[PDB]
Symmetry: D2
Subunit: 26 residues, 4 copies
């Protein structure tokens, strides 16, 4: 439920952002 | 991984959004 | 603040998910 | 666009996360 969602975001969002930026450059 | 973050975007984020909206009208 | 964030997510998240899936296949 | 969604991931999503956490402890 909410708590596991938050925890995935907190940990996993920074890598996602990096990735997406890379992909966009390419 | 991206894969884990990606599954939360598709299922836990939408429900979280609806949650936030409920709490804002309270 | 929160309301503009939500509104960007609601509208913009489905396209983001599609995109990311495509990129991952490639 | 992705570009618009991407800026919200980087600035409005983190603050929203902190918000949710405040509301959950209430």
């Amino acid at each position: 439920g909410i708590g596991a969602v938050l925890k995935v975001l907190t940990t996993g969002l920074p890598a996602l952002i990096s990735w997406i930026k890379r992909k966009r450059q390419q």
